[model samples]
Target: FVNQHLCGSHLVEALYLVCGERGFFYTPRTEEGSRRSRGIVEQCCRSICSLYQLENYCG
Candidate 1:
Protein backbone atom coordinates (compact mmCIF):
# COMPACT_ATOMS: atom_id res chain seq x y z
CA PHE A 1 0.00 0.00 0.00
CA VAL A 2 2.74 2.41 0.91
CA ASN A 3 4.81 1.53 -2.12
CA GLN A 4 1.84 1.90 -4.45
CA HIS A 5 0.16 4.94 -2.91
CA LEU A 6 3.04 6.94 -1.43
CA CYS A 7 6.16 8.34 -3.07
CA GLY A 8 9.15 9.36 -1.00
CA SER A 9 12.45 8.07 0.30
CA HIS A 10 11.60 8.60 3.95
CA LEU A 11 9.05 7.84 6.61
CA VAL A 12 7.55 11.34 6.55
CA GLU A 13 5.78 10.57 3.30
CA ALA A 14 4.52 7.27 4.64
CA LEU A 15 3.21 8.93 7.77
CA TYR A 16 1.63 11.67 5.72
CA LEU A 17 -0.21 9.25 3.48
CA VAL A 18 -1.53 7.29 6.41
CA CYS A 19 -2.20 10.02 8.93
CA GLY A 20 -3.38 12.72 6.50
CA GLU A 21 -0.52 14.98 7.58
CA ARG A 22 1.96 17.08 5.67
CA GLY A 23 -0.50 17.68 2.83
CA PHE A 24 -1.49 14.05 2.23
CA PHE A 25 -4.76 12.38 3.11
CA TYR A 26 -5.95 8.84 3.80
CA THR A 27 -9.28 7.26 4.54
CA PRO A 28 -9.56 3.63 5.39
CA ARG A 29 -12.57 1.58 4.31
CA THR A 30 -13.05 0.27 7.84
CA GLU A 31 -11.60 0.65 11.29
CA GLU A 32 -9.78 -2.59 10.85
CA GLY A 33 -8.19 -1.34 7.67
CA SER A 34 -6.86 1.67 9.47
CA ARG A 35 -5.65 -0.39 12.38
CA ARG A 36 -4.00 -2.88 10.05
CA SER A 37 -2.24 -0.18 8.14
CA ARG A 38 -1.05 1.34 11.34
CA GLY A 39 0.17 -2.03 12.45
CA ILE A 40 2.14 -2.51 9.27
CA VAL A 41 3.76 0.86 9.58
CA GLU A 42 4.65 0.37 13.21
CA GLN A 43 6.18 -3.00 12.46
CA CYS A 44 8.29 -1.54 9.70
CA CYS A 45 9.32 1.30 11.94
CA ARG A 46 10.72 -1.05 14.55
CA SER A 47 12.68 -2.82 11.89
CA ILE A 48 14.00 0.43 10.53
CA CYS A 49 15.00 1.73 13.92
CA SER A 50 16.75 -1.48 14.82
CA LEU A 51 18.54 -1.63 11.50
CA TYR A 52 19.72 1.94 11.73
CA GLN A 53 20.21 1.90 15.51
CA LEU A 54 18.11 5.02 15.79
CA GLU A 55 16.74 4.23 19.22
CA ASN A 56 13.41 5.67 20.28
CA TYR A 57 12.43 6.42 16.71
CA CYS A 58 8.65 6.53 16.49
CA GLY A 59 7.89 7.16 12.84
Candidate 2:
Protein backbone atom coordinates (compact mmCIF):
# COMPACT_ATOMS: atom_id res chain seq x y z
CA PHE A 1 0.00 0.00 0.00
CA VAL A 2 1.64 3.23 -1.12
CA ASN A 3 1.05 6.60 0.43
CA GLN A 4 -0.06 7.43 -3.06
CA HIS A 5 -3.45 6.15 -2.02
CA LEU A 6 -3.21 8.22 1.16
CA CYS A 7 -1.06 11.37 1.56
CA GLY A 8 1.29 10.76 -1.35
CA SER A 9 1.05 14.30 -2.65
CA HIS A 10 2.56 15.66 0.54
CA LEU A 11 5.25 13.04 0.41
CA VAL A 12 6.19 14.15 -3.07
CA GLU A 13 6.20 17.77 -1.95
CA ALA A 14 8.66 16.98 0.82
CA LEU A 15 10.70 14.97 -1.63
CA TYR A 16 10.71 17.87 -4.06
CA LEU A 17 11.90 20.32 -1.43
CA VAL A 18 14.47 18.09 0.21
CA CYS A 19 15.91 16.42 -2.89
CA GLY A 20 15.26 19.38 -5.07
CA GLU A 21 14.16 18.06 -8.49
CA ARG A 22 16.93 15.92 -9.95
CA GLY A 23 18.30 14.48 -6.74
CA PHE A 24 14.89 13.37 -5.55
CA PHE A 25 14.19 11.30 -8.63
CA TYR A 26 17.46 9.51 -8.21
CA THR A 27 16.46 7.98 -4.90
CA PRO A 28 15.24 4.46 -5.57
CA ARG A 29 12.21 3.04 -3.86
CA THR A 30 11.93 -0.64 -4.72
CA GLU A 31 9.05 -1.50 -2.41
CA GLU A 32 5.56 -1.53 -3.87
CA GLY A 33 4.43 1.32 -1.66
CA SER A 34 7.43 3.33 -2.64
CA ARG A 35 6.77 2.54 -6.28
CA ARG A 36 3.38 4.12 -5.91
CA SER A 37 4.95 7.00 -4.07
CA ARG A 38 7.33 7.39 -6.94
CA GLY A 39 4.46 7.30 -9.33
CA ILE A 40 2.83 10.15 -7.49
CA VAL A 41 6.09 12.03 -7.61
CA GLU A 42 6.37 11.39 -11.31
CA GLN A 43 2.95 12.73 -12.01
CA CYS A 44 3.43 15.76 -9.82
CA CYS A 45 6.80 16.40 -11.40
CA ARG A 46 5.32 16.16 -14.88
CA SER A 47 2.70 18.70 -13.97
CA ILE A 48 5.25 21.00 -12.35
CA CYS A 49 7.79 20.66 -15.14
CA SER A 50 5.17 21.21 -17.80
CA LEU A 51 4.29 24.47 -16.12
CA TYR A 52 7.87 25.65 -16.25
CA GLN A 53 9.10 23.86 -19.40
CA LEU A 54 12.05 22.35 -17.55
CA GLU A 55 14.02 19.83 -19.63
CA ASN A 56 14.15 17.20 -16.92
CA TYR A 57 10.43 17.59 -16.27
CA CYS A 58 8.22 14.80 -17.40
CA GLY A 59 5.89 15.42 -20.26
Candidate 3:
Protein backbone atom coordinates (compact mmCIF):
# COMPACT_ATOMS: atom_id res chain seq x y z
CA PHE A 1 0.00 0.00 0.00
CA VAL A 2 3.02 2.22 -0.01
CA ASN A 3 2.72 4.82 -2.77
CA GLN A 4 -0.93 3.89 -2.86
CA HIS A 5 -2.96 4.64 -5.96
CA LEU A 6 -6.52 4.37 -4.69
CA CYS A 7 -7.82 7.23 -2.64
CA GLY A 8 -9.20 6.33 0.78
CA SER A 9 -12.87 6.64 -0.16
CA HIS A 10 -12.33 4.74 -3.39
CA LEU A 11 -10.50 2.03 -1.54
CA VAL A 12 -13.39 1.87 0.91
CA GLU A 13 -15.78 1.57 -2.00
CA ALA A 14 -13.77 -1.26 -3.53
CA LEU A 15 -13.71 -3.07 -0.22
CA TYR A 16 -17.43 -2.60 0.17
CA LEU A 17 -17.95 -4.13 -3.26
CA VAL A 18 -15.71 -7.07 -2.48
CA CYS A 19 -17.04 -7.64 1.03
CA GLY A 20 -20.68 -6.84 0.39
CA GLU A 21 -22.06 -9.65 2.53
CA ARG A 22 -19.34 -9.62 5.17
CA GLY A 23 -20.35 -6.57 7.24
CA PHE A 24 -17.56 -4.51 5.73
CA PHE A 25 -18.81 -1.16 6.98
CA TYR A 26 -18.53 -2.04 10.65
CA THR A 27 -15.08 -3.55 10.12
CA PRO A 28 -12.13 -1.24 9.79
CA ARG A 29 -10.30 -0.63 6.47
CA THR A 30 -7.19 -2.60 7.30
CA GLU A 31 -9.04 -5.89 7.07
CA GLU A 32 -8.12 -6.01 3.39
CA GLY A 33 -4.55 -4.78 3.75
CA SER A 34 -2.94 -7.34 6.01
CA ARG A 35 0.64 -6.51 5.11
CA ARG A 36 1.27 -4.94 8.50
CA SER A 37 1.19 -6.48 11.94
CA ARG A 38 -2.21 -7.13 13.54
CA GLY A 39 -1.69 -4.84 16.51
CA ILE A 40 -0.36 -2.02 14.34
CA VAL A 41 -3.27 -2.39 11.97
CA GLU A 42 -5.82 -2.03 14.75
CA GLN A 43 -3.94 0.89 16.22
CA CYS A 44 -3.81 2.62 12.87
CA CYS A 45 -7.47 1.93 12.28
CA ARG A 46 -8.42 3.37 15.66
CA SER A 47 -6.34 6.47 15.05
CA ILE A 48 -7.86 7.05 11.61
CA CYS A 49 -11.40 6.44 12.81
CA SER A 50 -10.95 8.79 15.74
CA LEU A 51 -9.66 11.55 13.47
CA TYR A 52 -12.36 10.99 10.86
CA GLN A 53 -15.11 10.94 13.50
CA LEU A 54 -13.78 14.08 15.12
CA GLU A 55 -13.56 15.87 11.80
CA ASN A 56 -17.07 14.89 10.79
CA TYR A 57 -18.45 15.76 14.21
CA CYS A 58 -16.67 19.10 14.27
CA GLY A 59 -17.91 20.02 10.85
Best by lDDT: 2
Give candidates' CA RMSD values in order: 11.7, 11.6, 13.2
Q: How do the candidates rank by TM-score, highest first?
A: 3, 2, 1
In model 1, where do residues sit more than 4 Å from their true spots?
2-9, 21-59
Candidate 1 per-residue lDDT over residues 1-59, each given as its tens digit: 32332222354445544444324222335434454545344445444423222212323
Q: What is the C-alpha lDDT of each candidate?
A: 0.37, 0.41, 0.38
Query: Which residue pairs show collisions in model 2?
Result: none
- The digit string of per-residue lDDT tens for model 2 on 14-46 reads 455545646344335453446454554455443
Minimal lDDT window, size 10, model 1: 49-58
lDDT of 1: 0.37
TM-score, cand. 1 vs. native: 0.25
